[PDB]
Design a protein around this ligand. Structure first.
Ligand SMILES: [Mg+2]
Ligand SMILES: [Mg+2]
Ligand SMILES: [Mg+2]
Ligand SMILES: [Mg+2]
Ligand SMILES: [Mg+2]
Ligand SMILES: [Mg+2]
Ligand SMILES: [Mg+2]
Ligand SMILES: [Mg+2]
Ligand SMILES: [Mg+2]
Ligand SMILES: [Mg+2]
Ligand SMILES: [Mg+2]
Ligand SMILES: [Mg+2]
Ligand SMILES: [Mg+2]
Ligand SMILES: [Mg+2]
Ligand SMILES: [Mg+2]
Ligand SMILES: [Mg+2]
Ligand SMILES: [Mg+2]
Ligand SMILES: [Mg+2]
Ligand SMILES: [Mg+2]
Ligand SMILES: [Mg+2]
Ligand SMILES: [Mg+2]
Ligand SMILES: [Mg+2]
Ligand SMILES: [Mg+2]
Ligand SMILES: [Mg+2]
Ligand SMILES: [Mg+2]
Ligand SMILES: [Mg+2]
Ligand SMILES: [Mg+2]
Ligand SMILES: [Mg+2]
Ligand SMILES: [Mg+2]
Ligand SMILES: [Mg+2]
Ligand SMILES: [Mg+2]
Ligand SMILES: [Mg+2]
Ligand SMILES: [Mg+2]
Ligand SMILES: [Mg+2]
Ligand SMILES: [Mg+2]
Ligand SMILES: [Mg+2]
Ligand SMILES: [Mg+2]
Ligand SMILES: [Mg+2]
Ligand SMILES: [Mg+2]
Ligand SMILES: [Mg+2]
Ligand SMILES: [Mg+2]
Ligand SMILES: [Mg+2]
Ligand SMILES: [Mg+2]
Ligand SMILES: [Mg+2]
Ligand SMILES: [Mg+2]
Ligand SMILES: [Mg+2]
Ligand SMILES: [Mg+2]
Ligand SMILES: [Mg+2]
Ligand SMILES: [Mg+2]
Ligand SMILES: [Mg+2]
Ligand SMILES: [Mg+2]
Ligand SMILES: [Mg+2]
Ligand SMILES: [Mg+2]
Ligand SMILES: [Mg+2]
Ligand SMILES: [Mg+2]
Ligand SMILES: [Mg+2]
Ligand SMILES: [Mg+2]
Ligand SMILES: [Mg+2]
Ligand SMILES: [Mg+2]
Ligand SMILES: [Mg+2]
Ligand SMILES: [Mg+2]
Ligand SMILES: [Mg+2]
Ligand SMILES: [Mg+2]
Ligand SMILES: [Mg+2]
Ligand SMILES: [Mg+2]
Ligand SMILES: [Mg+2]
Ligand SMILES: [Mg+2]
Ligand SMILES: [Mg+2]
Ligand SMILES: [Mg+2]
Ligand SMILES: [Mg+2]
Ligand SMILES: [Mg+2]
Ligand SMILES: [Mg+2]
Ligand SMILES: [Mg+2]
Ligand SMILES: [Mg+2]
Ligand SMILES: [Mg+2]
Ligand SMILES: [Mg+2]
Ligand SMILES: [Mg+2]
Ligand SMILES: [Mg+2]
Ligand SMILES: [Mg+2]
Ligand SMILES: [Mg+2]
Ligand SMILES: [Mg+2]
Ligand SMILES: [Mg+2]
Ligand SMILES: [Mg+2]
Ligand SMILES: [Mg+2]
Ligand SMILES: [Mg+2]
Ligand SMILES: [Mg+2]
Ligand SMILES: [Mg+2]
Ligand SMILES: [Mg+2]
Lengths: 102, 59
RNA sequence: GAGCUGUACGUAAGCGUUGAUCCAGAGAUUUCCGAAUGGGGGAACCCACUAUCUUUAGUCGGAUAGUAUCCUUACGUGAAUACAUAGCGUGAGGAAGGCAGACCCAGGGAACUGAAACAUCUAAGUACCUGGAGGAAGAGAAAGAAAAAUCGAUUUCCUGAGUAGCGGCGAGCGAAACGGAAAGAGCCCAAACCAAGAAGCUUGCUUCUUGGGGUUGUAGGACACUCUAUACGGAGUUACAAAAGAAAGUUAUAAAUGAAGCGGUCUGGAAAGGCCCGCCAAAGACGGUAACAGCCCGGUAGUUGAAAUGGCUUUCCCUCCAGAGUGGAUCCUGAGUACGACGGAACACGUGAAAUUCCGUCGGAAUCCGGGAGGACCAUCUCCCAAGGCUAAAUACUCCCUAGUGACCGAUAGUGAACCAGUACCGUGAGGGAAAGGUGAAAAGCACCCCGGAAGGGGAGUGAAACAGUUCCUGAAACCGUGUGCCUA
RNA sequence: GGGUAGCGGAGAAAUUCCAAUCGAACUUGGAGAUAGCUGGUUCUCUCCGAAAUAGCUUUAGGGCUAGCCUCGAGGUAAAGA
RNA sequence: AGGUUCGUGGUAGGAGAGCGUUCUAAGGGCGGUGAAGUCAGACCGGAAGGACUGGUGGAGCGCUUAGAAGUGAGAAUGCCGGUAUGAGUAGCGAAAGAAGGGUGAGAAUCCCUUCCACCGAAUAUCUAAGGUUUCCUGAGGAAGGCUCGUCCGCUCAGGGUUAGUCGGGACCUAAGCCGAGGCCGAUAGGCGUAGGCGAUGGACAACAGGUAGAGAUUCCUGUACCAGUGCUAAUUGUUUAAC
RNA sequence: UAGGAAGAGUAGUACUGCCCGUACCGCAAACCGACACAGGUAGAUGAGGAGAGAAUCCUAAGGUGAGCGAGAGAACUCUCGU
RNA sequence: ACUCGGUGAAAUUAUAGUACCUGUGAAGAUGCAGGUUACCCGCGACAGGACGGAAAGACCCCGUGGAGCUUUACUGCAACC
């Protein structure tokens, strides 16, 4: 996908529009991403070996990758991304600031 | 296998007709005779038609 | 280029930037049955022989290779029976079976039905069975079509034309040439003769093989002489002879890059919608994203990319090559053939005044001073040269692969089958043959309390919605109930 | 455990049996056989409106021509009642 | 456009004008401030039909002018699905049960005890065929069981079948079947010799006990037999030739 | 007997002996009959009294009480007795 | 069979608030006319009617329907001479 695990994310649409977060996991097969502090759900969980006490656990849920834009590490605004092969590696390039995100 | 070994003619089908022109199926056979000839440097008995026999073969 | 160990959740144990999972080309491995092929057999099983090796103290056990039948061929052995043949053995090559329910060639070949009955006729050389194929098959270089003049190998399409004809002259069946187009291409033998060899002895001769020569109707060739030519030139694996090897280019089978709005505000669970502003465009195809997006994502136009394998096209290499003329002694030009009688079939043509083609059975020519046709046949004329063979393209079809299209269907429709469908089920068998799609944007799939053994409920909670609660969008009618305004013994 | 198969087989013979099927088994195909016979054939209004007869017919509960209905167009030395 | 006159029952049937459904094209629109569909109303037109308002629903659909049709159902002993009536009706598939304890949420129906009754050339014990896990143990009670069920040939999870001698093959053949060469025949194939398959028959070496969840001539304990092999110890034979 | 043949038997010891079936039902609720169906299904064994007997009646070993019940005791129908 | 507890079908069916007599009518009426009877809802019984249910009458006729059989019907074919 265009967004990797460990990246910084600005949420572009949805109920959490305007918020920012970090990628905790990526699901390219189904095209979803898990982002910290974003799209919290409440699960009614019975007591089990995992989660010994159970209850109403408040955790995170995936959102679609199209509702996401990368944050420039310096300019700090959502940018579309380009790809430039610099040296022996192809790196991602911010298309507003014209600089290398990686 | 019932056929002449030279000019291999055999049975063919056709019609038998009556007066009033009723049509039925029949065959025509060749008159193959069982004769001993030289198929090689050796003799053997084979079917040969009486037509292929009136000039050329060696009995 | 960052996650991965399928559907398919989950648990467990692990692997990946020292670059995994994944995608494409090329390799290796590939149990048993099945043409099944060492023998047998009731499918996926049973039992071997011969060589070489291996284990044990030795029986017992293990590994590898070979071992079916028929056809062609080489060698060897070898009967009645003397030579020899049959037979037997070994080796080397080849075949066998399947299918795309299509297309085409051949052998065999119905009936229902129509004729307002029915037998000739029709249906129909159809259905079906069997055998051969090929990517196409079949046909094909005039013993042709014609007719005051000519054309010039086949095939397919348009016309001719429902014409000319056939026909219990009923029902019906039904051309061809000329004319206009698509596509176009021509060639090898046999025989006269030459040269060599071999067998018979047909005993100094014929007849067998090989090589050369030569293929046509104004007749052509052999044969005689002139001219040139043995690679100067020409041709080629699609016929015309056949087998290889290189290089360049292109294409197919993975991919890369790729412009422009997080614009403000309203409603809302969510904006791609409304209102107000911008921008890109060789890119406003299509799909996704919480509602209807050229500017969010995958992408699109444009421009690039191939280690490996395949195809195609050129060039080289390689290979193979006599063609003009003038003569008219003698010679050659497809024999049980062409034709005819008899019995059938195919020709639009049902025996008819019946030409033309094929089959079975009998009879049976001429050969250049020759033979065939022009719808009985004769004469004249005109056109042609049978009884040997090969040949691309234009034509037919689709089990498949790639890219697309539709005033085609939308779950009783469209395939029988949108779902683990030729399945469940029925039948001894051949065979017949279903029903069955939809939670939500996201499992956030209802912690906890209460009645109950559970099922099932009532709260509480999630969600925009639970009257969306795992046959779950909507939710008609029949049909079954509870309550009630008016009437009724 | 085996053999005989439908234009066939078996029958101490009854048209008897050949997988609950037999004056000619079952299955698939020709095949949507053919049916002058019976049944069925789906929205509305406006104008007109029959026949159940003659002739022939392998014809008689079928057909064909004429007669009778409807729509359109014509011509008059006006022909209809 | 307006008059005048004459008309306006209708089956088979002829002629005309229209309504509504799906799709296409152009124009012009509606719609999360709620589309289609569905429900209910005392509205409009000469008919087929058409609006308006409210509930449910939760994403698409009208209008105009043209065009094209899988174009309108009440009947076919029509095809498929759903649901009635008969009706709490017929039936519940040959037969002897009773009580006391137990288990359990729950007992005529499950377990135990006692008494009674039935079969007994069988309704007892083996074993071929056929079936194919139905066998044992632990859990279970939605559906199946013509009632009930705590039970089960039912559901779930784990188990369970041991052979030199038993039955079959590695042994034999009958009927019948296949069949190298062969004979016959439009094709396909039919018949058949050598050879080979094929038991329902012939030949062939093991008995008695024990085994408390499920196997027993198979496992175990005693005592055997059949066929072979090596190793020891004696005997004997060698090409007028042991065997 | 034709043939093959220098090894052979004897006694004792110890070792070797493959593949397939094997559960369970089997006059039956497990097989053939669409059913937990008054039908059908080869063979071996098959006790006592009385008896010719495998007839008949009552019993042994062994196996069963049959997958809807209780209570009333009308017509009528069925199977029985006078 | 009947009453009680458990379980629980089917053939059939245009909608039904479903009397009798004499008549009428496609000529034999629960439903039409004129009269005569008759409070509403059931349970156990019996079969006169609903031209009761079941099976598109096997008899009879018709169709230019079919099939099996016969012969000195017609036209054929095998086989034999
Ligand atoms: Mg004919
Ligand atoms: Mg002859
Ligand atoms: Mg002759
Ligand atoms: Mg393997
Ligand atoms: Mg085989
Ligand atoms: Mg074999
Ligand atoms: Mg086996
Ligand atoms: Mg060995
Ligand atoms: Mg030889
Ligand atoms: Mg000799
Ligand atoms: Mg083949
Ligand atoms: Mg093929
Ligand atoms: Mg015929
Ligand atoms: Mg014909
Ligand atoms: Mg014809
Ligand atoms: Mg074929
Ligand atoms: Mg090929
Ligand atoms: Mg071609
Ligand atoms: Mg060809
Ligand atoms: Mg030519
Ligand atoms: Mg020629
Ligand atoms: Mg010419
Ligand atoms: Mg063309
Ligand atoms: Mg030559
Ligand atoms: Mg010359
Ligand atoms: Mg914004
Ligand atoms: Mg809001
Ligand atoms: Mg917007
Ligand atoms: Mg475009
Ligand atoms: Mg789009
Ligand atoms: Mg945008
Ligand atoms: Mg001659
Ligand atoms: Mg002639
Ligand atoms: Mg002639
Ligand atoms: Mg001519
Ligand atoms: Mg000519
Ligand atoms: Mg050819
Ligand atoms: Mg639906
Ligand atoms: Mg869903
Ligand atoms: Mg959804
Ligand atoms: Mg409780
Ligand atoms: Mg609950
Ligand atoms: Mg709702
Ligand atoms: Mg809903
Ligand atoms: Mg409802
Ligand atoms: Mg309703
Ligand atoms: Mg009321
Ligand atoms: Mg028959
Ligand atoms: Mg009799
Ligand atoms: Mg009979
Ligand atoms: Mg109109
Ligand atoms: Mg409508
Ligand atoms: Mg529109
Ligand atoms: Mg509605
Ligand atoms: Mg409504
Ligand atoms: Mg309404
Ligand atoms: Mg709603
Ligand atoms: Mg039209
Ligand atoms: Mg249509
Ligand atoms: Mg339709
Ligand atoms: Mg109607
Ligand atoms: Mg019908
Ligand atoms: Mg029906
Ligand atoms: Mg249904
Ligand atoms: Mg129905
Ligand atoms: Mg019912
Ligand atoms: Mg008790
Ligand atoms: Mg089971
Ligand atoms: Mg039950
Ligand atoms: Mg019951
Ligand atoms: Mg209990
Ligand atoms: Mg059990
Ligand atoms: Mg044994
Ligand atoms: Mg054997
Ligand atoms: Mg024995
Ligand atoms: Mg010993
Ligand atoms: Mg073995
Ligand atoms: Mg074994
Ligand atoms: Mg038993
Ligand atoms: Mg006695
Ligand atoms: Mg008795
Ligand atoms: Mg006893
Ligand atoms: Mg009761
Ligand atoms: Mg009852
Ligand atoms: Mg009255
Ligand atoms: Mg009453
Ligand atoms: Mg008639
Ligand atoms: Mg009959």
């Amino acid at each position: 996908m265009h967004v990797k695990k460990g990246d910084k994310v600005k949420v572009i649409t949805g109920k959490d529009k305007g918020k920012s977060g970090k990628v905790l996991a990526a699901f390219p097969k189904k095209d979803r991403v898990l982002i910290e502090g974003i799209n919290m759900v409440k699960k009614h969980t019975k007591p089990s070996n995992i989660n010994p006490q159970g209850g109403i656990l408040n955790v995170e849920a995936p959102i679609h990758v199209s509702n996401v834009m990368l944050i420039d590490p310096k300019t700090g605004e959502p940018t579309r991304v380009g790809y430039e092969v610099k040296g022996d590696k192809k790196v991602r390039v911010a298309k507003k600031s014209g600089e290398v995100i990686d | 296998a019932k056929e002449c070994v030279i000019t291999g003619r055999k049975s063919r089908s056709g019609n038998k007709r009556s007066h009033a022109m009723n049509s039925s199926k029949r065959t025509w056979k060749a008159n193959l005779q069982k004769v001993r000839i030289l198929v090689n440097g050796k003799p053997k008995k084979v079917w040969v038609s009486a037509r292929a026999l009136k000039s050329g073969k060696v009995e």
